[PDB]
Design a binder for these strands. Structure first.
Lengths: 205, 123, 150, 206
RNA sequence: UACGGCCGCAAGGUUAAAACUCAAAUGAAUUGACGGGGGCCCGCACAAGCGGUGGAGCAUGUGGUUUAAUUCGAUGCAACGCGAAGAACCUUACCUGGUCUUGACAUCCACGGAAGUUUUCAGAGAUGAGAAUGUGCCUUCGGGAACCGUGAGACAGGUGC
RNA sequence: CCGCAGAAGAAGCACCGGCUAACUCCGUGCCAGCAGCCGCGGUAAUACGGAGGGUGCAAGCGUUAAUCGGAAUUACUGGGCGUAAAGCGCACGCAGGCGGUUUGUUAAGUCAGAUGUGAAAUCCCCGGGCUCAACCUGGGAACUGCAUCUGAUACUGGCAA
RNA sequence: UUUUUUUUUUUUUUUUUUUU
């Protein structure tokens, strides 16, 4: 359903450092920002007021990999929530089952991660819940299953993320590969560089 | 700046202007083709486009267009009616969708895809 | 580190004797990050020059709006001919959902929480000329105390 | 609605010649065929640093070519093997020798030409030249001058798009025959067609 | 506006209903059409006058004559003596035929050559068939010039507005 | 669910102005055609009509018979009367709406609550149970009035003076 | 607040793309 690619194309129209392709080489070598991305009109593009938010929509839709269906069925219940935009909508994208697995180090890309989850490798306290819109609440656990536990893909996530920032809101054991969300997300350390509030005000045009 | 002169022809090029008279129920229908007409000399050189009339209780008589391709659009048939008056045509106020029954229309024109409903070529 | 934006212009060019005559105008605003905002108009022979004559005019001192701290406490009367106008505060956490037809009057100082779009006229010159004169007519948190005692 | 030269009309008044020579009644014609030929070789050999003034004197029809280029060291080269080529190719057409004299273009910021050789470089990147154009003007005027106007014409967008853009960082009295003004132009391309730039630089009042 | 009547002496008053339809405008405020307003004027505009142009005879391009067949574009302030200040070699429109489509002019390599004076006969001209006399400057006799060829592969143009 | 065996076996529609959205190469002469507000085609038609690329989204894409959207509008709860539409020359009295304003006074409406109704899927919120999104539900709640009464005296109505 | 010196003079097609 999640369109699948060409994947590096998305980076040449959405932007730089995307978790889509976080690993090996193709960063600054091939992602074609400042070189010439939209080559034909690159002499002069012109932006728009809806323009700048519609590609920040795009950012959030394509970095984590989700439908417009989810973008309306997360909005449905968000309309009851008590907090701000970047807790009622954004915070959920770092914490749905297919996207938490990369944050912990069980797959080296965000397009990898969803596909390890959909292939029955991952559980949450004993539940194989590959219905991947399922969002892992704080403190209840999440693991890779036994014969998938130390599979080549996990190691090449762990020995590459080792030098990188391990963020404060969740934890993992790198040697038995299991973890949870340790506290609630906050719009002050969540580490997406986006202006959060702007995906929800885009529905006001 | 002088409204009963301006109102006609200022600046727009889609325009509203249409005249769509009578109603009685709804404008879409099934259309007994009542009698077939092939005639009436004009500067638009209007060959083969054989308009028909429609027995509908409306207060005055009414007429409808061939919609598109398909020569055998026969006066005993009861295909479907919708609005849209092409500038080519006096007297008419509606055009057919003529693909049901025995009528065919679309003989082999592969480009129709969802537009009228057709299957794929040698792809 | 002051803030500079435009909001409106006229196509102002006409038939005469005679061919065609042309002119070039603006309407602009400026702000300081410590809750200060201002406005004004210009004209020139050239378009980015009618912006400069405007924005040099918007730089006059910049009114300190009563902002305590991420929102504001009273909807001041932006009196005009039929605009009306009245803003609607919001509870300190939700954003500047106001009329993008004028929003730069509140955006240039950073103000995170206020809304209302342009309630009686969809012409910016009307909801601009109205907003800045409500903002100069305001009262501090400290003034409303005196207004209701001593 | 006009383009009105300040220079040219004024050869002896603060604004000195592009070229000057004295050829007689039946000895001009070849001198004129050589004044484009000698300038075409030089202005392609010197392109690596431009030439503000490509000055053709001819002291005895032999040609005293004075090249105010912003890097003379790269046309002295590794020490004077280019000079040798530089004094032969323009003398090969003219049938006489060539008195090659070098100079610097003393600060391209304040110059009578080299502002348009900022701008027309910027197009060799093909991406958002708008980031740098009006900034280059800014930068130049920060070491010298007191006003400048700029006009740029050409294919500077995409597919079929062709417009003209005009900017003013300071006041320009268009023609004042007493003043330290200049006009200049330069050229650039972008794989769709031309990009032709123009300037007026009111540097001083006298 | 009528299709019930309340009134009215009839015609009408008063209810402001409706079949069906169809796309925005009144108002400010600003234009200013070339304008025998009022008012300030002004010019052979008109004055007072002068020498005429005109009707018959000539120099001559439209149109207009049918002529074997006809060259655009000219048609008041913004077009007259075309543009042609030489429409019978004539700077070729066009009527014809002869000819070509690198043509006529002009380069980059390849293999070669001395450049020309003079006369006879054909052909409408371009072009065709013969006959005599001629052979330069350096000069590594290498390389070629002054200067003519034939084979290539790139390859030439015009008021079209 | 657990071993083998193969990326195997699963995807396309609107299209492509500008509306949320990515474009040219051409065709046919307001041919033939979209006709919703726009906008398009009057020999160089960006979406008409053929095609080539890629886009919006992925069992989904365009679109439809209509009504309100945005837009504010029959307004006890929400109003314009210089404007669209907009105090209708004119008022004999008959019903009607507003009847002076305070003390001693009352509590029928005003308000506060006692207790009842609205057993069960709400709408609003939390807690779970299937692998689980769904789904299947448990818990807490809030339902102007109506009844039947304990109060409280500033309005709505009165009684006395 | 006397202001008739003639009444009339067919249509078009002018408009150097656009977001600011």
């Amino acid at each position: 359903a999640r369109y699948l690619g060409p994947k590096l194309k998305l980076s040449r129209r959405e932007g730089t450092d995307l978790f889509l392709k976080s690993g090996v080489r193709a960063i600054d070598t091939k992602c074609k920002i400042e070189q010439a991305p939209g080559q034909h009109g690159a002499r002069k593009p012109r932006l728009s007021d809806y323009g700048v938010q519609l590609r920040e929509k795009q950012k959030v839709r394509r970095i984590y990999g989700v439908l417009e269906r989810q973008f309306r069925n997360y909005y449905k219940e968000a309309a009851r929530l008590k907090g701000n935009t970047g807790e009622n909508l954004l915070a959920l994208l770092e914490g749905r089952l297919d996207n938490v697995v990369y944050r912990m180090g069980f797959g080296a890309t965000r397009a990898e991660a969803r596909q390890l989850v959909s292939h029955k490798a991952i559980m949450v306290n004993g539940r194989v819940v590959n219905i991947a819109s399922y969002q892992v609440s704080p403190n209840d656990v999440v693991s890779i299953r036994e014969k998938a536990k130390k599979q080549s893909r996990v190691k090449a996530a762990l020995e590459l993320a080792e030098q990188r920032e391990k963020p404060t809101w969740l934890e993992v054991d790198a040697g038995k590969m299991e973890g949870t969300f340790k506290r609630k997300p906050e719009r002050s350390d969540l580490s997406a560089d986006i202006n959060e509030h702007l995906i929800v005000e885009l529905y006001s045009k | 700046a002088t409204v009963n002169q301006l109102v006609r022809k200022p600046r727009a090029r889609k325009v509203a202007k249409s005249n769509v008279p009578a109603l009685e129920a709804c404008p879409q229908k099934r259309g007994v083709c009542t009698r077939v007409y092939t005639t009436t000399p004009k500067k638009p050189n209007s060959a083969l486009r054989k308009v028909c009339r429609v027995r509908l209780t409306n207060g005055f008589e009414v007429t409808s267009y061939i919609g598109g391709e398909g020569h055998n659009l026969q006066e005993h048939s009861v295909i479907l009616i919708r609005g849209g008056r092409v500038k080519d045509l006096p007297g008419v106020r509606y055009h057919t969708v003529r693909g049901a029954l025995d009528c065919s229309g679309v003989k082999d024109r592969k480009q129709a895809r969802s537009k009228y409903g057709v299957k794929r070529p040698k792809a | 580190e002051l803030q500079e934006k435009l909001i409106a212009v006229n196509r102002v060019s006409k038939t005469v004797k005679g061919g065609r005559i042309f002119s070039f105008t603006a309407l602009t605003v400026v702000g300081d990050g410590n809750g200060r905002v201002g406005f004004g108009y210009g004209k020139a022979r050239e378009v980015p020059a009618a912006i400069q004559k405007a924005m040099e005019k918007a730089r006059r001192n910049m009114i300190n709006v009563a902002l305590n701290n991420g929102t504001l406490q009273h909807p001041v009367k932006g009196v005009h001919t039929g605009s009306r106008v009245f803003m609607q505060p919001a509870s300190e956490g939700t954003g500047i959902i106001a009329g993008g037809a004028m929003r730069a009057v509140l955006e240039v100082a950073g103000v995170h929480n206020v809304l209302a779009k342009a309630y009686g006229s969809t012409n910016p010159i009307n909801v601009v000329r109205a907003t800045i004169d409500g903002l100069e007519n305001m009262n501090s948190p400290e003034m409303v105390a005196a207004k209701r005692g001593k | 609605g006009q383009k009105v030269h300040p220079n040219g009309i004024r050869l002896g008044i603060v604004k000195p010649w592009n070229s000057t020579w004295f050829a007689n009644t039946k000895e001009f014609a070849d001198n004129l065929d050589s004044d484009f030929k000698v300038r075409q070789y030089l202005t392609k050999e010197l392109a690596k640093a431009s030439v503000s003034r490509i000055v053709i004197e001819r002291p005895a029809k032999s040609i005293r070519v004075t090249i105010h280029t912003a890097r003379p060291g790269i046309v002295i080269g590794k020490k004077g093997e280019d000079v040798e080529k530089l004094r032969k190719v323009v003398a090969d057409i003219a049938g006489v020798p060539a008195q090659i004299n070098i100079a610097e273009v003393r600060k391209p910021e304040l110059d009578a030409k080299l502002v348009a050789d900022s701008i027309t470089s910027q197009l060799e990147r093909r991406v958002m030249f708008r980031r740098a154009m009006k900034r280059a003007v800014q930068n130049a005027m920060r070491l010298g001058a007191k006003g400048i106007k700029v006009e740029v014409s050409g294919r500077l967008g995409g597919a079929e798009i062709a417009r003209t853009e005009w900017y003013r960082e300071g006041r320009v009295p268009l023609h004042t025959l007493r003043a330290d003004i200049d006009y200049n132009t330069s050229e650039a391309h972008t794989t769709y067609g031309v990009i032709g730039v123009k300037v007026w630089i009111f540097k001083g009042e006298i």
